[PDB]
Amino acid sequence: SKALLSFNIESINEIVAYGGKPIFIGGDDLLCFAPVCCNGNNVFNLVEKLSTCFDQCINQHLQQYINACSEAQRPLPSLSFGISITYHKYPMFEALHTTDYLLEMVAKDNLFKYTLSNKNILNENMKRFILKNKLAFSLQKHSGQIYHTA
RNA sequence: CGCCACUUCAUGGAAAUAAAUCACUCACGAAUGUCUU
């Protein structure tokens, strides 16, 4: 809880310093509206800064668990990111749906899990193939050219 | 000293060889994000 609160405060500070707007940052959830590029920094620079802040807070407040999971060879807490860049006149509801789709379905690999679970073949060996720590990014131009990657 | 002409009329080698084979720029821009009953 201490690590999450510290990360939330530092993420608010970083979003304000970059030049964006914090919508909601609480627990493990973050929602921000930021410029594509301003004062030389990009969106991906902000994402890297947020990931660094999360890692720093995890190290600072969870050092015992980090040390235990280091030699035990177990994954550490991580942040999955979903970035959508759209024209300012593009509907905000569609942009938010695109961001949710990116984050959940691609960045959290919920497409694999959802397709497996709808057919009831999730099992455990298949659950071994759930991939986290992903960045989903999509840029839709004014002509709908949409560049997307993960 | 005199007298006197014939013969021969292109073969062999090289017959193309390397370098560059597209380069840069633009890869959508503006309007409309609902309107009238």
Ligand SMILES: [Mn+2]
């Ligand atoms: Mn959450």
